[PDB]
Amino acid sequence: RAWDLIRYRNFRTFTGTERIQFNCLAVDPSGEVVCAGSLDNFDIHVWSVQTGQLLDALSGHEGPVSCLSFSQENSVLASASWDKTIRIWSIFGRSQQVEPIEVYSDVLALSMRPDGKEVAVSTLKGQISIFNIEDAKQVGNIDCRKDIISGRFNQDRFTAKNSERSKFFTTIHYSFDGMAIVAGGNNNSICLYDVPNEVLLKRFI
Amino acid sequence: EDYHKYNRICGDIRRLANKLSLLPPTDPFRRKHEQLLLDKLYAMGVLTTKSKISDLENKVTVSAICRRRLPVIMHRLKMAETIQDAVKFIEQGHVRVGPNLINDPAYLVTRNMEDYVTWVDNSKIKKTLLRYRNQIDDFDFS
Amino acid sequence: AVPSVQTFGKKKSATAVAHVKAGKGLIKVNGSPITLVEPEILRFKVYEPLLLVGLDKFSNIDIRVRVTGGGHVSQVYAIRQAIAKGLVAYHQKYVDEQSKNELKKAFTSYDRTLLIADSRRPEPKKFG
Amino acid sequence: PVTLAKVIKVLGRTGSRGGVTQVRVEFLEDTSRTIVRNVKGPVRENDILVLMESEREARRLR
Amino acid sequence: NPYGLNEVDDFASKREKVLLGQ
Amino acid sequence: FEVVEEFTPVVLATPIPEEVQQAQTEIKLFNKWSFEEVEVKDASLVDYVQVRQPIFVAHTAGRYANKRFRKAQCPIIERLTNSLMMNGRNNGKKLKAVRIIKHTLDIINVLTDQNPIQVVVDAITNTGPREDTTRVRRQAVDVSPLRRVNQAIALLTIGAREAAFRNIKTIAETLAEELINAAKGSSTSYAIKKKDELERVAKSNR
Amino acid sequence: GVSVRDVAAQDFINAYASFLQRQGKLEVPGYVDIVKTSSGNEMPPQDAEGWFYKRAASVARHIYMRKQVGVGKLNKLYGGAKPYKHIDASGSINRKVLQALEKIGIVEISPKGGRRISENGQRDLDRIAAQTLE
Amino acid sequence: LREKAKERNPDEYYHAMHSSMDQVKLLK
Amino acid sequence: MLRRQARERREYLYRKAQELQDSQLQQKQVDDEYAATSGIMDPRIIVTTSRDPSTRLSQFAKEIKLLFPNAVRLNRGNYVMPNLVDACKKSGTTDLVVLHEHRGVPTSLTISHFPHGPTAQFSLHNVVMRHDIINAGNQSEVNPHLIFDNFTTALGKRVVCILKHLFNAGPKKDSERVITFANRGDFISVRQHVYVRTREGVEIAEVGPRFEMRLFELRLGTLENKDADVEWQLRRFIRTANKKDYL
Amino acid sequence: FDRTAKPVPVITSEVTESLEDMIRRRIQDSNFDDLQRR
Amino acid sequence: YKLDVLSSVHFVPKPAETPTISMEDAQPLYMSNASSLAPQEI
Amino acid sequence: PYKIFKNTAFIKDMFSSAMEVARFEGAQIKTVSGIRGEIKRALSKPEGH
RNA sequence: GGAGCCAGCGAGACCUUGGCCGAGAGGUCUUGGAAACUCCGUCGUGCUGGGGAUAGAGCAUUGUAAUUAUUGCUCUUCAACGAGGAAUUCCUAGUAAGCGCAAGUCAUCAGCUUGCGUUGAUUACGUCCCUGCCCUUUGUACACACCGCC
Ligand SMILES: [Mg+2]
Ligand SMILES: [Mg+2]
Ligand SMILES: [Mg+2]
Ligand SMILES: [Mg+2]
C-alpha cells in the first residue's frame, strides 16, 4: 500500500495475482517502481507506482528473498536470499542484466552504501560482508559471532556459550557518512562497527 | 498421550464452519471467511491440498495436527529413528527450522517452512553424518 | 590425537581432497611434491596460496592432497582451492581466529576464487 | 599538438548513425571549456579522449 | 508411521509397493 | 629500527626452489618481470591498460565478458594472450599462447634491455588509433579508449600472425619485432602503418 | 629417504637411461634399429643408439609406481591415437624390455603374473634418484 | 532404486553412524 | 529446494491420479498444470537444439522461434540437461523446445512444460523451411489466430491443450496471421497463413514452414527425468499399428 | 508383404487444396480455437 | 490466535451509553477534511 | 542376426544386395520366438545387410 | 621421435588379468567375469620431413569351398590441394570453436543420432539513424508531479 503523508491517505494499493505473502520491500528513488519479496515464491514482484500494474516478476533466485534495496544514486537493485547468493538487477534500461554473487552462508539482511558503490550483507555465520557493486568482488568482511551477547532462556536446558539460537544479525544499516554500520538481531546486543577498519566501535545492551 | 487441546481446535473449526453454513450462501461475508479459513488451514499444511468447506468439516483431524508437529516431521524426514529421539534432538537444540532455532517439541511446521527444517550448523551429529560419507568440511564448520 | 583438518576444492569435474595436519612442512599432491605438478606453466598457480601468505606458516604443518577428475587446468584449480581452504580451516580449529582473518583478507583481496567455488551455472541472459 | 578532454555526459536520442555516440567533453587544460563530439568506440562518462582538433562543433550524422 | 500418512504420501507408498512387487 | 615477524629460520622439509622464495618477496610475471616500474605514458590509456595487479601467469579464468566494462579490469598480458589464439586451429589452446608470450618476452629482453612488459604497454599506447572514420562517403570521428586498446591489441596480434604465417620466422620472434617496432613508433610495425593510414584517411574526410 | 616419485619423471628417466647405457649389461635385441614401437608410428626412433635404454628406464619407473605390471599394460600405456583406432604399442619391444631388466635384477616375476620391482632394483632406482638430486 | 538414490535426504541421521594360503588361514 | 521439487513432484503426480479418476467418473476443463496460469501470464518459451547443431537445424530453430511470439532461441553448446532444465526453471521459463536433426534435416521436436511437465515428443516429416523459399520476406509477429481441427479423442484434447498454451492469450480479432494444426490419421499438419478479408470471401497466403508432427511419447515430467511415469506411448509393433488411430 | 507401420503421408496438391479450403472456411465463420483472457 | 501461537516462533499477545473518546485517529487533528480532497475531486 | 543393440539389430543372409533390401523397407518381420520387428534401413557395407 | 600425464556419461559361447612368439597385423598357453595437451629433441619456407588419392609387391584374419571376396599390417609409388569468385548462412560466456569417449533404451539414426566430459576465446552488451515487426493518439490513472482536441 502506497501512502501520501501530506494528506494522510492510501492513494494506491498493489497485490500479487495469487495473494503472495510479502516480507520485504524496496522503492525506486524516482518513486515510479516498487518491488517486494516473499518467503514462498522466490520471485521479486515489480509494480508501477503510477499505474498500479505488475510490470513483471524478476526470477532467478534459488531461495527465498530476504531483503531488497534500490541504489539511491545509480538505481541498481540488490537482492539477497537464503540462497547463499546475491543478485544485482539492472532493471532500468533497454536491456536487463543480472550479476549473481555467491556468499558463504544464508543472507539475512542487506544494507546499501548511499553512494551506491558498495553493498553490505549479514549472514547466518555472523559475518557482515561488503562487496563492490560495479566489480562484484568482496572488499571487506567483519566478524560478528563473538561480539554478540545472547542470554540463556529460562526454558533452556543447554548453555548459552554452546547456544547457536542467535549469533547472527537479522538487520543492518549504514551510516549516512558511510563509515559505520549499525546491526541487531534476536539478541540483547546492538553493535556499532567501523567499516574501513573492521572494528567494533561500541556495543549496547 | 492427551489430545484435549487439539480436539478443541478441531471442534472449533467445525463450529465455525457450522456457523458459516447457517449464514446465507449469497452473503459475500460468508464466502471470504470460508476462503480465508481454507487458506490458513492450507497454509499450515493440515490441508495437504486445497479443499472445500465440506471437506474441511470432516478432513480436519487430531492426527493431521499431530502430523505437523516438528518431531513427527523429522521422523518422516528420517532425521530421527523415533518420535522420542526427535524430541530429544529438539530438546538438546540441534534442530533448526529456517533462520531460527526451535527447542520446543510442541511446535508445528507450516507447509512453506517444511522444506527448511535442518540441523544447526555446529551440531556435533552433523559432523558424524558427513564423517560417515567422508564429506566433512572443517572450513564450513560442518 | 594428532591435530588435523580436511577440506575440498572443486572445479568442473575436478575434485581435490586436502588433509592439513601438524608437521614439519610436507606439502604433497598425489603422493608427490608440489614442485613436480604438471603443466609447469601453471605450476605457479599452485604456488600462489603458498606464495601469498608466506611459507613460514607452513613450516609447522604437513598437507597431503589427492586429486581426481577433470582436466589438467581444472585439477590445478582444485589443488589451489583445496590448499587455501585447508589452511584456513586449520588456522581456525587449532590457531586463533585473528590469523584466520588475515588469511581470508589476503586471499579474497588477491582473488576470491581461492575460497569460493567458481561454478558458472547456466544463465539465460535473454529474458524469455 | 593534441588536446585531451574528459567525457562528462553521454548524449542520448541524438539521432546519430548506428555505432556513433554523441558526447560532451570538458578539456583537461581548461575544465570549464566544453565541446560536443562524435565517438565511434564504446564510451562512458569520466573517460578522457584525445581531441586532435579542438575548434569544431559536432553535428548529427544520420 | 505412528500417526499415518497424508493422502499424497499414502498414494506414493502404494505405487512404491506395486513397483517392488514387480 | 627493525620490525621482526619471524624468529626462526623457515625451512620446509619438502624442498622449494630459492627463486620461489624471492617470488615470496614479490610477485612477478613468470617470476622474472616486475610490475612495479610500469606506467602508461599516455593518460588516455590509463584505467583501460590495467597493470596494477601483478600476476605470475596470464591464465586466470576470470569472468570478464559478464558486464559491459569488465575487460578494462583485465591484465593487459592476459588480453594479449587471448587475442593471440585465433584462426580456429589454434582456438582453445591457451597454454600455448602463454608459452609463446613467455618466449616473446624473453626475446624482447634479449634484444632490448628495458623491461619487456613496459615495451608491451608502450606499443599498446602508441599503436592505438586516436581518430578514425565512419561511413555516412566517410566522416571522421573520435575513438574511445576501450576501442583504442582493443584495436591496438588486434592490430599487433594480426600483424605478428600474418608476418610469420608462411615465413621462416616463428610467431614469438615476429610478435617480438612487431611489438618492439611499435614501441619505437617506427613505421616498420604493421599496426603503426594501419593506425597512421586510418588517421590520414580521417584527415582526408575531415 | 629419496624416492623416484620425488624426482621429475623426465629427469630421472634421462639419468637412468644413461646408466643402463654406461653399464653396458642390458641386453638389446638386434632389431631395435628397424622398429617404430607402434604400427601407428611411421619412422623408427631418432635416438637409435639409446632409445631402447630410455625405453627400459621408462618401464622401470612404471613398475615402481604400480607394483604389478604386464606387457598388456605397457602395450596400452605406450600406445597412442592413429576414424581413430588407438593402436597399442609393439608387444615385442616391451616384452624384450621386461626380460632385459630382470637379467639386470631390476625387476622380477611378480606373484599372480606380471612384474614386480626387485628389492635390489628398488634400491637401484633410488640410487639414481638421489644422483639426479645431488 | 534410482528414485531412492535420487531422493536421499542428505540430512538423514541414524544412530548406527557413530560406529602358503592354508598357513595364513590358520594364522588368522 | 531438492526437498521441495521432490515434494511438489510427489504432489504433482497425485493430482494426475486424482484428475484421472474424476475424468473416468465423469465418463461413467483445462489441465491442472495449465489451470493455474491459463489466461493469466503469457507463456515463456525457450527454443534450443542438440549438441553441435548443423546450420540447417540452427536455421530451423530460428523458424520455430518466429512461429511462437514469446520464443527466444538459446544456443546449446556443451549444456548439461539437468543444468539446462534447472537454469530455465530459475528464469521462469514456461516451456522448453529441443530440436533434433539427421543430416541437416529436422527429425524430432520435444516440448516440455515447466515446472513439472508434461513432456511431449514429436517426429517431424516432410519438413520445408522458409529459407527454402526465394524472396520470401519477413514474418509478421502479431499474436496469431489458432485453428485446431479433427482432435476428438481424450488424448487429442490433451495434445491440443499442450500446443494451445504455447501462444499468447487474446489475439486481436483483426489479426491477419493464422496458425492451423490439422489432424489427419495422427499426422498433425502445421501451416502458417496470412489472410485478407475480401468483399466476397477470404484469400489466404501460406507463409510456412510446412511439416507434419506425430506424437510418439507423452510423459508426466520434465524431459530431463527419464524415469518420469509415461502418460501415453505409441505402440508401433502391435499388429493393428498400421491402421490404428489415436488422435 | 505386410507393413507394420503407417506410411508417412504425402502432401499432394489436392490435399493442400482441401487443407486451404478448410482454413478459408474457418476464417469465413471466424471460428478460431484460441486462448482468451479469463 | 490459537493456530498462530502454535506456529509462531516468537511472542504473540492475545488479541483484544456514554460518549467515547476515539483513542487513535486515522488523520492529524489540525488537518481539515476539505484539505484532504484533491481539486479534481471537488 | 550378427549384431544386436537392445531393440535394434542387424540381420544378414536374408537379402543378397541392398537393392533387394530397398524393396522391403517397412516390411513386417518376426523371430521364431514371436518378437515382432521391422526392416528399418539397408546397410551400405556389406551388401544385403 | 621420445618422455609426461588428467575425464564423465553409461551394463539383457563371448570378454578378458597374466605368460610365450611375431616388426606389425596377428597367433598361442592360461586366470576371473581417451584426445587435444605438456617437456626435451630432429626438420625447416622448398608443393618441403604438409597432403595420402591412385598403383605394384608381399605378411595375416573372416567366412566357404571358392584359387571367391572380406578386413588389417610391411615396403615402394606420390597425385589434386598454397586459404577459395559472384554470392550466401549463422553467431554474444563455458557462447563461437578445437578435442576425444560412451549408448544405440518402440518414432529418426549405423562412421549416422543422441549423450558425456576435456581446452576455451575476440567483439558487442548501445541505438532506433537504415531495414523489418508491432503498440498509442476517451490520462481513465486513487495522492503528489506532468499533461491538455492527431
Ligand atoms: Mg560447436
Ligand atoms: Mg562431435
Ligand atoms: Mg548432431
Ligand atoms: Mg541487446
Task: Find out whether D23 and D30 touch, Cβ atoms under 8 Å.
Answer: no
Q: What are phi and psi of A24, to 5 degrees?
A: -140, 155
Task: Find out whether C74 and C11 touch, Cβ atoms under 8 Å.
Answer: yes
Q: How do beta strands I177-184 and I145-149 pair?
A: parallel
Instruction: Using a CB–CB cutoff of 8 Å, tell me whether K7 touches chain A.
Output: no
Alpha-helical segments (H) within chain L: 18-23
Task: Find out whether F106 and D8 touch, Cβ atoms under 8 Å.
Answer: no
- The Cα–Cα gap between I193 and I198 comes to 15
Task: Find out whether F183 and F126 touch, Cβ atoms under 8 Å.
Answer: yes
- The Cα–Cα gap between I189 and J10 comes to 11
Task: Find out whether A148 and A166 touch, Cβ atoms under 8 Å.
Answer: yes
The packing angle between helices F94-111 and F76-84, to 10°, is 120
Task: Find out whether F121 and F76 touch, Cβ atoms under 8 Å.
Answer: yes
Across K3-27, b (16+ Cβ under 10 Å) vs e yields: beebbeeeeeeeeeeeeeeeeeeee
SS (H, E, C) chain F: CCCCCCCCCCCCCCCCCHHHHHHHHCCEECCCEECCCCCCCCCCCCCCCECCCCCCCCCCCCCCCCCCCCHHHCEHHHHHHHHHCCCCCCCCCHHHHHHHHHHHHHHHHHHCCCCHHHHHHHHHHHHCCCEEEEECCEEEEECCHHHHHHHHHHHHHHHHHHHCCCCCCCHHHHHHHHHHHHHHCCCCCHHHHHHHHHHHHHHHCC
Task: Find out whether B50 and B38 touch, Cβ atoms under 8 Å.
Answer: yes
How far the first Cα of chain F sits from its last, in Å, is 64
Task: Find out whether L42 and L49 touch, Cβ atoms under 8 Å.
Answer: yes
Q: Which of B12, B44, B100 sits opposite K7 (nearest CB)?
A: B44
A137 Cα to chain F: minimum distance (Å): 11
Instruction: Return the bridge partners of F75, or none.
Output: F50
Instruction: Return the bridge partners of I78, or none.
Output: none
Q: Which residues 30-89 of B have a C-beta within 8 angstroms of I? A: 48-49
What's at F201, amino acid-wise?
V
Angle in degrees, CA A134, A139, A141, rounded to 5? 140
- The Cα–Cα gap between J30 and I173 comes to 9
Q: Which of J8, J11, J34 sits opposite I171 (nearest CB)?
A: J34
CA distances in angstroms from I120 to I114, I150, I216, listed in the order given? 12, 19, 8
Q: Which positions of chain M lie under 7 Å from any protein Cβ?
A: 1-8, 12, 16-27, 34-42, 44-46, 70-71, 73-75, 82, 89-98, 100-101, 103-130, 132-135, 141-145
Cβ within 8 Å of residue C93, ≥6 positions away:
B138, C3, C5
Burial class (CB in 10 A: 0-12, 13-18, 19+), C125: middle
Instruction: Return the bridge partners of G76, or none.
Output: none
- The Cα–Cα gap between I92 and C126 comes to 12
Task: Find out whether A44 and A57 touch, Cβ atoms under 8 Å.
Answer: yes
CB pairs under 8 A between H and I: 6
Q: What are phi and psi of B101, to 5 degrees?
A: -95, 135
Burial class (CB in 10 A: 0-12, 13-18, 19+), G29: middle
Q: Which residues 2-41 of K have a C-beta within 8 angstroms of B? A: 2-3, 6-7, 9
How many domains would you assign to chain D? 1
SS (H, E, C) chain A: CEEECCCCEEEECCCCCCCCCEEEEEECCCCCEEEEEECCCCCEEEEECCCCCEEEEECCCCCCEEEEEECCCCCCEEEEECCCEEEEECCCCCCCCEEEEECCCCEEEEEECCCCCEEEEEECCCEEEEEECCCCEEEEEEECCCCCCCCCCCCCCCCCCCCCCCCCCCEEEECCCCCEEEEECCCCCEEEEECCCCEEEEEEC
Short-list I73, I21, I81, I27, CA closest to I51? I81
SS3 state of residue I182: strand
Task: Find out whether G78 and G89 touch, Cβ atoms under 8 Å.
Answer: yes
Short-list A57, A32, A55, CA closest to A44? A57
CA of G65 to C1' of M12 (A): 39
CB atoms within 10 A of CB G73: 16
Question: C25 is in which domain, residue-wise?
Answer: 1-127
Cβ within 8 Å of residue F33, ≥6 positions away:
F105, F115, F116, F117
Task: Find out whether I108 and I122 touch, Cβ atoms under 8 Å.
Answer: yes
Task: Find out whether G100 and G26 touch, Cβ atoms under 8 Å.
Answer: yes
For residues H2, H5, H7, H10, the Cα torsion angle rounded to the nearest 10 degrees is -170
Q: What are phi and psi of A8, to 5 degrees?
A: 60, 65
Short-list L47, L36, J5, CA closest to L14? L47
Contacts of J3 in chain L (CB under 8 A): 26-28
- The Cα–Cα gap between G58 and G63 comes to 9
- The Cα–Cα gap between A41 and A81 comes to 12
What's at D38, amino acid-wise?
N
Burial class (CB in 10 A: 0-12, 13-18, 19+), F184: middle
Task: Find out whether L38 and L29 touch, Cβ atoms under 8 Å.
Answer: yes
Sign of the dihedral through C-alpha A136, A142, A145, A147 = negative
L3 Cα to chain J: minimum distance (Å): 22
Instruction: Using a CB–CB cutoff of 8 Å, tell me whether H28 touches chain I.
Output: no
Length in residues, chain C: 128
- The Cα–Cα gap between B37 and B52 comes to 10
- The Cα–Cα gap between F176 and F163 comes to 12
What's at F158, amino acid-wise?
I
- The Cα–Cα gap between G125 and G116 comes to 13
- Residue J19 C-alpha cell reads as 487443407
Task: Find out whether I174 and I189 touch, Cβ atoms under 8 Å.
Answer: no
Interruptions in chain J after residues (C–N over 2.5 Å): none
Q: What is the CA radius of gyration of chain H?
A: 20
What's at B119, amino acid-wise?
W
- The Cα–Cα gap between A137 and A130 comes to 9
DSSP state letters, I49-60: E-SS--HHHHHH
Q: What are phi and psi of I156, to 5 degrees?
A: -60, -45
Task: Find out whether L36 and J12 touch, Cβ atoms under 8 Å.
Answer: no
3-state helix vs strand vs coil in chain D, percent to 5: 0, 40, 60
- Residue F82 C-alpha cell reads as 587471448
Task: Find out whether F80 and F191 touch, Cβ atoms under 8 Å.
Answer: no
What CATH number is attached to the domain comprising D37?
A: 2.40.50.140
Cβ within 8 Å of residue C83, ≥6 positions away:
C9, C18, C27, C46, C49, C50, C63, C65
DSSP state letters, B31-59: HHHHHHHHHHHHHHTSSSS---HHHHHHH
Instruction: Return the bridge partners of A80, or none.
Output: A67, A86
- The Cα–Cα gap between E15 and F31 comes to 65
Contacts of K31 in chain A (CB under 8 A): 7-8
- Residue E16 C-alpha cell reads as 512404491
Task: Find out whether B116 and B76 touch, Cβ atoms under 8 Å.
Answer: no
SS3 state of residue J37: coil
- Residue I36 C-alpha cell reads as 493455474
- Residue F158 C-alpha cell reads as 594480426
CA of I162 to C1' of M44 (A): 65
- The Cα–Cα gap between B123 and B141 comes to 9
- The Cα–Cα gap between D52 and I132 comes to 52
Instruction: Using a CB–CB cutoff of 8 Å, tell me whether B109 touches chain E.
Output: no
The packing angle between helices F145-163 and F76-84, to 10°, is 40
Interruptions in chain F after residues (C–N over 2.5 Å): 136
- The Cα–Cα gap between F33 and F58 comes to 13
Angle in degrees, CA B118, B122, B123, rounded to 5? 65
Ligand index nearest the alpha carbon of residue I50: 3
- Residue K22 C-alpha cell reads as 476515539
Q: How do beta strands L28-30 and C61-68 pair?
A: unpaired
What CATH number is attached to the domain comprising C106?
A: 3.30.230.10
The single residue listed with the C-alpha cell 559471532 is A145
Task: Find out whether F75 and F51 touch, Cβ atoms under 8 Å.
Answer: yes
**Residues 1-20 of F, Cβ under 7 A from nucleic strand M:** none
The packing angle between helices F18-25 and C43-53, to 10°, is 60
Helix or strand run (H / E) with residue C11 = strand C4-11
CB atoms within 10 A of CB A125: 18
Cis-peptide, bond into residue C124, ω within 30° of zero:
no
**Resolution (Å units):** 3.9
Short-list I122, I50, I46, I37, CA closest to I89? I46
DSSP state of G32: G
Helix or strand run (H / E) with residue E17 = helix E7-21
List Cβ<8 Å contacts ≥24 apart for E1-7.
E1/B76, E2/B72, E2/B75, E2/B83, E3/B63, E3/B66, E3/B67, E3/B72, E4/B63, E4/B67, E6/B48, E6/B64, E6/B67, E7/B48, E7/B49, E7/I14
Contact I79 C127 (CB under 8 A): no
Nearest residue (CA) to C1' of M44:
F168
Q: Which of B77, B80, B129 sits opposite H17 (nearest CB)?
A: B129
Short-list C126, F188, F10, CA closest to I74? C126
3-state helix vs strand vs coil in chain L, percent to 5: 10, 25, 60
- The Cα–Cα gap between I176 and I186 comes to 28
Helix or strand run (H / E) with residue B136 = none
CA of F166 to C1' of M43 (A): 16
Helices and strands in chain D, H and E counts? 0, 4
Task: Give the nearest nucleotide to D43, CA to C1'.
Answer: M126
- The Cα–Cα gap between B120 and B102 comes to 10
CA distances in angstroms from A27 to A42, A91, A183, listed in the order given? 19, 13, 22
Residue F161: alpha-carbon gap to chain centroid:
15
Task: Find out whether I145 and I177 touch, Cβ atoms under 8 Å.
Answer: yes
Cβ within 8 Å of residue F80, ≥6 positions away:
F58, F101, F120, F153, F156, F157
Domains in chain F, CATH or no CATH each: 7-206 (1.10.455.10)
- The Cα–Cα gap between A174 and C54 comes to 35
- Residue G70 C-alpha cell reads as 604386464
Instruction: Using a CB–CB cutoff of 8 Å, tell me whether I91 touches chain C.
Output: yes
CB atoms within 10 A of CB B91: 15
SS3 state of residue J35: coil
Task: Find out whether I97 and I89 touch, Cβ atoms under 8 Å.
Answer: no
Task: Find out whether A68 and A26 touch, Cβ atoms under 8 Å.
Answer: yes
- The Cα–Cα gap between B17 and G107 comes to 90
- The Cα–Cα gap between J24 and J30 comes to 10
List Cβ<8 Å contacts ≥24 apart for A35-43.
A35/A68, A35/A70, A35/A77, A36/A68, A37/A64, A37/A65, A37/A66, A37/A67, A37/A68, A37/A79, A38/A64, A38/A65, A39/A64, A39/A65, A39/B112, A40/A64, A40/B112, A42/A81, A42/A83, A43/I92
Across G88-115, b (16+ Cβ under 10 Å) vs e yields: bbbeebbebbbebbbebebbeeeeeebb
Q: What is the CA radius of gyration of chain I?
A: 19
CA distances in angstroms from B3 to A4, B45, C78, E6, J34, listed in the order given? 50, 19, 56, 19, 54
Contact H9 B125 (CB under 8 A): no
Short-list I187, D33, J23, A10, CA closest to K36? A10
- Residue C65 C-alpha cell reads as 592432497
- Residue F73 C-alpha cell reads as 579490469
Question: Which chain I residue lies closest to L26 (C-alpha atoms)?
Answer: I242
Sign of the dihedral through C-alpha F85, F90, F94, F99 = negative
Short-list I154, I152, I159, CA closest to I118? I159
CA distances in angstroms from C75 to B75, B100, C11, I79, listed in the order given? 41, 38, 7, 21
Sign of the dihedral through C-alpha I233, I234, I238, I244 = positive
